[PDB]
Amino acid sequence: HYFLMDKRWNLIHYNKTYVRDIYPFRRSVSPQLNLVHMHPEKGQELIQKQVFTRKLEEVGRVLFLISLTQKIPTAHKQSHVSMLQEDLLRLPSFPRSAIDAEFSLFSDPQAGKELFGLDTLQKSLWIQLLEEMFLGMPSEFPWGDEIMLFLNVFNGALILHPEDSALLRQYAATVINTAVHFNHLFSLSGYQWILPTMLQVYSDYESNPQLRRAIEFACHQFYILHRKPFVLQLFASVAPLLEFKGVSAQCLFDLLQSLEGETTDILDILELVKAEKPLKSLDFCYGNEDLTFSISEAIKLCVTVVAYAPESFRSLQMLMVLEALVPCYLQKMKRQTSQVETVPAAREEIAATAALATSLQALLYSVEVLTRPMTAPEELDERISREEFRRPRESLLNICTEFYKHCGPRLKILQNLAGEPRVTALELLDVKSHMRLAEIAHSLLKLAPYDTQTMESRGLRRYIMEMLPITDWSAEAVRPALILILKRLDRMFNKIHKMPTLRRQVEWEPASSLIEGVCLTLQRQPIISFLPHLRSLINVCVNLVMGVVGPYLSPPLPFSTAVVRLVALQIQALKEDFPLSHVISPFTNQERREGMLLNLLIPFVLTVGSGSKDSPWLEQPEVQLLLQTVINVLLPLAESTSQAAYLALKVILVCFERQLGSQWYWLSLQVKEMALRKVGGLALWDFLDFIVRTRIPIFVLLRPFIQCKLLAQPAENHEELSARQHISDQLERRFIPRPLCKSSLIAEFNSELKILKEAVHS
């Protein structure tokens, strides 16, 4: 209800107006105001009216100055312009006055749109006045960071009224006029003061095709004036705005694709350009028929900026730009070659992929100082240094992995559809490139054990799990990259397994991801199995899974599963060079057999036996060895050890049922001896109940002993009495066909293993 009001001069003050703007004189007598109580609607109406009048006054002031400047003769033009520029600079509130708006008054349905019209007029007038000032200053005027003070107004006018066509084309015309006039400034800088705003507006108003067309036309004219410097400045000004709000990675590619093709002038921007000629390159060196700006040229530019100074901050900006551009470029190439006939497009896409491969091999060759490890460097500064270390390496790994993954199968398909076998399968990312990727990943891995963020890095994970498997690893030339990666992984996991328990705090999700990448590489190319570093890595992983005190914290389910899968794959590859008996020998001793059963043997049998009706991955001698190991844990005992042994016996009997073959009589004899000796004591009746439930091939052999003999013996305790009664009930007058494709049995085994594992540590 209450409004500040002036009675001497009939003024009611809008809240967002600065006091000194209206009362500017520092006279002895201070202004006197009244806290006038008004009906809020009446007060807001008065404020709207007076604000409109004030804005019209400001419009008149700007117009008066514009006319005064235009009346000045050809001489005295530079003096007048310099006076204006210095006056604006020394004015403490120049950009604020020329850029502000009444956002609290635009929303009113009454007298709100009139203020908006006046605001559009005022912004256009300010743009025209600043262009008049700019054109009249020396073209080689020594500028600095102060030019932003004058260019922000332009940007301000494009934030408030981007969709206004008159304002948009006025902005484009004046920016082109300043780029032409201050050519030297805008050939090295200047676009950095302007391009981020245009990119933000282009990305924000994606739904506005007219605004996007105007921005694309303006960028095309910029490329016409300054060709390579403008593209480099565009990438430098889009790098902070890229996201993986913010300028997307697709709108940048849309802008580039608009750059490569000529665009029509729908808003007649060129007619407002003061130097309105067929626009040419303002630099004679770039004078050429390079009106086409290929995306390949942009990729080469980014590669070159990185090659110039790999460790520069601008280098990592251009690496981010490349990481944003290359996926879009590959998808666009695929779409273009899919939309047209394969016969003509195959050659074009093959040539484009070869060009991109050469560009990326140049990028990898010209970056060897990023292969160096992080030289040992308050805490925030160290974290910033580590992030700046990790960023370029991660971006390079991502770029190379994405390109290789997309263009491997794509190149194979193209050569199949090329119509001519003369096209040789050019090995994109040659040996030196693979070595570069491996050494970059090696530096990241060397940093990893001390940084939780480095091992969680998406670039390193993508390289390990999606680039190592893809590589051939058949030729001896490429193998040393894999050997280096394997040696680094072996060393880091050995250090984790080593004396320092603090190193064990490393998150096991990234470690399991690395092991999964190794497993995928081994499965894809079994030929890499003979590498000694791989054997050492598998040995270290096995020692990690087993509870071993450094010469403890058990690794979680994912890491243990990955290690067990690696062991299974290695045993599958090396039939006799890596026997499972060798894996299980260092743990068959007492005080360690329980951990072997619950951490290696049972997970191994679950991983190998399950997954198919038949499991030929494990050979007969290995099955015999595992059965002997379990029975030796049983026959020649602790309660938990006996329970684990019986669970492992069940798992082997079910998973490896077919593999046992003609080995049921001896198993029946061993089980009968176990029953006679009361080896289990407890849960032996549970084992017999399991045998009766599943009716496994030993059930038919053990039926007489269980029925006529075992049940004849009297019960000792109620705990065994209940199990004996349940077994007797399950023997006769109970069919209950529970088995079903072995899935339920495997689920039961896994659940019992989890329960026993949880019970052991507690």
């Binding site: 007298a111 749109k113 009139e114 908006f116 019209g117 559009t120 009224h161 969709e163 206004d164 066509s165 008159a166 948009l168 739904s207 506005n208 095709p209 007219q210 605004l211």
Partner: protein, 275 residues
Amino acid sequence: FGFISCRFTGYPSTVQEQALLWLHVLSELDITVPLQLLISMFSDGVNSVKELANQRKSRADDDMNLNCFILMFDLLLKQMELQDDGITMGLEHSLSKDIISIINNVFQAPWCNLCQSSILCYQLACELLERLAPKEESRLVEPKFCYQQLPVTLRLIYTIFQEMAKFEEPDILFNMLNCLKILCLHGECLYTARKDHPQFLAYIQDHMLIASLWRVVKSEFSQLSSLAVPLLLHALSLPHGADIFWTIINGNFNSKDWKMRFEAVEKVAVICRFL
């Protein structure tokens, strides 16, 4: 496709959305569901939604209905990319008329996230109209009635204007003006209305066409005017347009309210910008 088909003949948007989703998953696999059956079951679905809404009104879902319609338009577009290849059926086609009727009913049907879904629905309808159009702007200018018994395109134009009277978001109005440009231009809908349905064109001209095109002309959103002005010129070439425009200009510029003249100056300037 009986199990999908049954889901649309008399069930609310909750039931129909499941079928539309598991038909979307089929379309993602390039499984060519025949377009005639798809159109028939979509007409059945829209009619069922409308009948259920009418029953609810008589006895006396919005996001659900709008999402169902978005999926409907999207599936029509995706299946037309697998069957209607190499030929653009004109607006006067057996199935194009059915698609136009579906779009008409969807626009008429009772529909932050709501605004985005509405914009998407209008955009997909515009894409469908582009697919059904000759895809080439004809000559822009040439140098009561019964609401039914009209060609479906005339009803669609009528309802697009009627709905555009109820919206203010620039994206919505841009998509609706784009639909009209596909209908009024890109196809002699209003020309054939003049030739065959003079009363309907007279009613549209006198009541909705130029008034709404004048309303949608704004300097802040010149994207809207980029589509409004060609449609406005096409309307002026048609009968009864010159008189309505004359009355609009005379009433606005001669108004005593200085705000009305202030707005009319902007309107005429923006009209001139895109002439």
